[PDB]
Amino acid sequence: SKPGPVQVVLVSFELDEKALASILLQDHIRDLDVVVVSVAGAFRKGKSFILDFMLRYLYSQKESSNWLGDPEEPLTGFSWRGGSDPETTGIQIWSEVFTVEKPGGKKVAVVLMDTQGAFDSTVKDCATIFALSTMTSSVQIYNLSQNIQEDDLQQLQLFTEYGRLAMDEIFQKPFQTLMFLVRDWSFPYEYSYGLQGGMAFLDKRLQVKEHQHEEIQNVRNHIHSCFSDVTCFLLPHPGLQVATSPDFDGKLKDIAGEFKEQLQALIPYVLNPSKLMEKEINGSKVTCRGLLEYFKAYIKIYQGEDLPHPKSMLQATAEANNLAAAASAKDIYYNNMEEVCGGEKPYLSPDILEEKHCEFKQLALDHFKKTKKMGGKDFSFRYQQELEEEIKELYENFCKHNGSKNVF
């Protein structure tokens, strides 16, 4: 009953769909728009240290004020690396999804994602892990040591023709925020720690120059077709005790002061309620229920020998987008009907049951049609017709359950 990391993508690659569904289709979050914060990068680069502070912020927020902690008390990690073979490639998420009220009262679900791979441009693939993580997250925090290297940028080539395809055919950038998190920044006299120094440094690194390799200048020329926002944050060194310790357990006061300072800017910048950014695809928000569909559609196309064609990535996106609309409509029909004739609630005469059915079927189909969907009308119809068959089967079970409560 204790929260912990859940392996959702593992070694080709497999989606553990049951484990992911058990988190995302919980009753209290499945209908909420979901915020998906991913930290991605090479093994042993401090990703889980940052994930731990994000959890401290989220748990402090859940139960309140000094999120950083008590300076006298030792730190304890949250066990993102507790399993066998911690250097393994894959994607984990935290088992506790948080519910946060944004200003004005809208409640959203907040998922934390741990994306680990070799991250080195050669022989094998973890590009699959970076792609799946990027396409499903709303903030991809790309965790790098000391600088943004040309190798680092070359790994974004995965998305370049995808971004160019989507702009050309759907008139929209496919992804939201990419943030370069530069660890152990050592030149504050050139670019100061934090966000303003980071954006000046990123601007310089993103400039195309004739000596760079062709593929890297490509990435520079099209990264802004992929992400609606590209940002960078320079974080200081945490101090030698953190750097040289396996499983750091020293007191908060033993962490370097400038690191703590910049942590208090970085973590709220990502997780403060006014900053939470719901996942969006095709310009419409994704719920925990819908997010499951994107994982299921994306795992399929990354099964092959080679990386998928961009047309197949757009195709999988369109299919999952319509399935997400259908699933949301199906839940509306089911929840309303179960409220009215489910359980041991009293028998309803066929006239009353039919009327309720007609009311909630129309509600459900209207919701599907009103929802913004990719593919055009003929593409979306096949999903609508599928939804109508599901509703018909649901209605039959509701009718047979209702009839079992009849007297004689």
Positions at the binding site for GDP = 44-49, 81, 183-184, 242, 245
**Closest to 217 (Cα-Cα) out of 157, 175, 133, 259:** 157
Question: Considering the complex, what minimum distance in angstroms separates the CB of residue 108 from ligand GDP?
Answer: 26
If one counts every other C-beta atom within 10 angstroms of the C-beta of residue 297, the result is 20
Question: Considering the complex, what minimum distance in angstroms separates the CB of residue 266 from ligand GDP?
Answer: 11
Tell me the binding residues. Answer: 44-49, 81, 114, 183-184, 242, 245
Does residue number 251 form part of the binding site for ligand GDP (CB under 6 A)?
no
Residue sitting closest to ligand GDP (CB): 46
Question: Considering the complex, what minimum distance in angstroms separates the CB of residue 77 from ligand GDP?
Answer: 8
Binding track over 125-164 against ligand GDP, x by CB under 6 A: ----------------------------------------
Does residue number 242 form part of the binding site for ligand GDP (CB under 6 A)?
yes
Taking CB under 6 A as the binding criterion, the range among 17-25, 58-66, 241-249, 265-273 that sits at the site for ligand GDP is: 241-249
47, 112, 258, 256: CA torsion to nearest 10? -60
**Closest to 170 (Cα-Cα) out of 128, 223, 225:** 225
Helix (H) or strand (E) holding 280: strand 280-281
350, 356, 357, 362: CA torsion to nearest 10? 150
Does residue number 334 form part of the binding site for ligand GDP (CB under 6 A)?
no
Total residues interacting with ligand GDP, rule: CB under 6 A: 17
Q: What's the CA gap between 338 and 334, in Å, rounded?
A: 6
Cβ-contact 277, 100 below 8 angstroms: no
Of 51 and 291, CB closest to ligand GDP: 51
Does residue number 183 form part of the binding site for ligand GDP (CB under 6 A)?
yes
Does residue number 265 form part of the binding site for ligand GDP (CB under 6 A)?
no
Cβ-contact 328, 287 below 8 angstroms: yes
Record the tokens describing residue 31, joined without a space.
Answer: 């209908």
Does residue number 252 form part of the binding site for ligand GDP (CB under 6 A)?
no
User: What residues from 54 to 83 belong to the interface with ligand GDP (CB under 6 A)?
Assistant: 81
Record the tokens describing residue 214, joined without a space.
Answer: 């062709």
From 49, 67, 98, 334, residue interacting with ligand GDP (rule: CB under 6 A):
49
Q: What's the CA gap between 128 and 394, in Å, rounded?
A: 37
Of 118 and 242, CB closest to ligand GDP: 242
Question: Considering the complex, what minimum distance in angstroms separates the CB of residue 80 from ligand GDP?
Answer: 6
Does residue number 260 form part of the binding site for ligand GDP (CB under 6 A)?
no
CA dihedral for 201, 202, 208, 213, sign (positive or negative): positive
Of 266 and 276, CB closest to ligand GDP: 266
Question: 282-287: which pairs have CB atoms within 8 A and are 24 or more residues apart?
Answer: 282/170, 282/172, 282/317, 282/321, 282/372, 282/373, 282/374, 283/172, 283/372, 284/371, 284/372, 285/33, 286/33, 286/34, 286/324, 287/30, 287/31, 287/32, 287/33, 287/34, 287/109, 287/324, 287/328
Does residue number 275 form part of the binding site for ligand GDP (CB under 6 A)?
no
Of 263 and 314, CB closest to ligand GDP: 263
3-class SS at 86?
coil
Of 197 and 290, CB closest to ligand GDP: 197
Does residue number 46 form part of the binding site for ligand GDP (CB under 6 A)?
yes
Question: Considering the complex, what minimum distance in angstroms separates the CB of residue 4 from ligand GDP?
Answer: 15
Does residue number 258 form part of the binding site for ligand GDP (CB under 6 A)?
no
From 28, 44, 309, 311, residue interacting with ligand GDP (rule: CB under 6 A):
44
Question: Considering the complex, what minimum distance in angstroms separates the CB of residue 68 from ligand GDP?
Answer: 15
Helix (H) or strand (E) holding 109: strand 107-117
Taking CB under 6 A as the binding criterion, the range among 41-49, 210-218, 349-357, 370-378 that sits at the site for ligand GDP is: 41-49
Q: What's the CA gap between 20 and 219, in Å, rounded?
A: 32
Tell me the binding residues for Mg(2+). Answer: 114
Taking CB under 6 A as the binding criterion, the range among 3-11, 38-46, 170-178, 264-272 that sits at the site for ligand GDP is: 38-46
From 10, 13, 25, 43, residue interacting with ligand GDP (rule: CB under 6 A):
43
By the 10 Å C-beta count (0-12 exposed, 13-18 middle, 19+ buried), 125 is classed as: middle
**Closest to 155 (Cα-Cα) out of 127, 189, 176, 123:** 127
Question: What secondary structure letter does DSSP report for 138?
Answer: S
Which residues form the interface with ligand GDP (CB under 6 A)? 43-49, 81, 183-184, 237-238, 242-243, 245-246, 248
